[PDB]
Curated annotation (Swiss-Prot):
This is Carbonic anhydrase 2. Keywords: Acetylation, Cell membrane, Cytoplasm, Disease variant, Lyase, Membrane, Metal-binding, Osteopetrosis, Phosphoprotein, Zinc. It is found in: Cytoplasm; Cell membrane. It comes from Homo sapiens (Human). Residues 1-257 form the Alpha-carbonic anhydrase domain. Changing V140G: Weakly impaired activity. Changing Q90P: In OPTB3; in Czechoslovakia. Changing T196 to S/V: Reduced activity. The gene is CA2.
């Protein structure tokens, strides 16, 4: 009986095995746009993905991860509220059973159809494992997804989902360019937070883009065909794999614009 998104093992149950669930800097959070403050101290954000080397896509039972080669400085995130260089290790999404929900962060309580998380670790810590033992070990770039026109750069991901339908399945996924998932603007909100799935470690500097990307109904509908279960087990559609907004507590959300 492990954690999940159901009635008996969902987000409201996580604190029992992971006490930090009720911590001081948990994510996601609602982004109250009128409370956020423009921060002049924020340096320009740098997203360098031209050398990104994707390797595989995996259904881990919670979502599907597109993994990258992080043995060298290729795809990195720098600038903004960040000090140093953060290396891309994987990206995944969170989505709902309907277009009206799915995102983890919300904007003035608005829920988007999905949310993309590009996960990076601080290179000064040597590895992802050591990085998650530091308060500034990770940087996650969050991007909202709304339903409308199709996102060409997402189609290659959508088309391979049929090959990793169940938990534990993986497939080669080389030469995928994450630059095709980014909106035009890099305006963002930033705050200190945590991982949104167990172990819910508080080592994340969150950078959430204001501009969402548009994906087609057809594209997100295929996300909903994935399974939480493993092959040969009763089918449980992988939907609503998102954690709700958590208490902001002693934190302030800063804006890079205005
Ligand atoms: Hg940490
Ligand atoms: Zn996530």
């Amino acid at each position: 009986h492990h954690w999940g998104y159901g009635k008996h093992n969902g987000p409201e149950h996580w604190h029992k095995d992971f006490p930090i669930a009720k911590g001081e800097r948990q994510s996601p959070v609602d982004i109250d746009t009128h409370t956020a403050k423009y921060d002049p101290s924020l340096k320009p954000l740098s997203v360098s993905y031209d050398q990104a080397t994707s390797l595989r896509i995996l259904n881990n039972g919670a979502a599907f991860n597109v993994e990258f080669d992080d043995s060298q400085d290729k795809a990195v995130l720098k600038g903004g509220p960040l000090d140093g260089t953060y290396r891309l290790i994987q990206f995944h999404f969170h989505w709902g059973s309907l277009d009206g929900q799915g995102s983890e962060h919300t904007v003035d309580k608005k829920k988007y159809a999905a949310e993309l998380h590009l996960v990076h670790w601080n290179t000064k810590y040597g590895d992802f494992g050591k990085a998650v033992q530091q308060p500034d070990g990770l940087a996650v770039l969050g991007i909202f997804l709304k339903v409308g026109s199709a996102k060409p750069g997402l189609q290659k991901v959508v088309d391979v989902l049929d090959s990793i339908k169940t938990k534990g399945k993986s497939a080669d996924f080389t030469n995928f360019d994450p630059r095709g998932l980014l909106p035009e603007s890099l305006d963002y909100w930033t705050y200190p937070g945590s991982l949104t799935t167990p172990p819910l470690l508080e080592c994340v500097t969150w950078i959430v883009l204001k501009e969402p990307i548009s994906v087609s109904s057809e594209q997100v509908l295929k996300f909903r065909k994935l399974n939480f279960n493993g092959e040969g087990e009763p089918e449980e559609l992988m939907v609503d794999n998102w954690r709700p907004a958590q208490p902001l507590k002693n934190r302030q959300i800063k804006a890079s614009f205005k």
